[PDB]
């Protein structure tokens, strides 16, 4: 069961998808005064789902950069590219 968090990394490519979309969203939030990035809106049978992303997973890094060191200019540049790497932190689904 869910006790400690688990951290894992994935590398995803648009050429492995049907329609050049990974099938998830990233939520930029302020949570108790702290800026965080979360996985959200994971499409069933989409690439992100295949790679084991879950809504609510915290994104710790994108392309080897800490989430709290990103800005919107970097975000847009990163997700304009044909591929992207993520470090995420999750709980077991159950």
């Amino acid at each position: 069961g869910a006790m400690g968090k688990v951290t894992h990394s994935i590398h995803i490519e648009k050429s492995d998808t049907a329609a050049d979309t990974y099938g998830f969203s990233l939520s930029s939030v302020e949570e108790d005064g702290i800026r965080r990035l979360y996985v959200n809106s994971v499409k069933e049978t989409g690439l992100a789902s295949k790679k084991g992303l879950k809504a609510g997973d915290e994104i710790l890094e994108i392309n080897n950069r800490a989430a709290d060191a990103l800005n919107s200019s970097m975000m847009e540049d990163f997700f304009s590219q044909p591929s992207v790497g993520l470090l995420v932190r999750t709980y077991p689904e159950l």
Partner: peptide, 8 residues
């Protein structure tokens, strides 16, 4: 408090 959603 969500201030942006990126759909990728």
């Amino acid at each position: 408090n969500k201030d942006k959603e990126y759909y990728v």
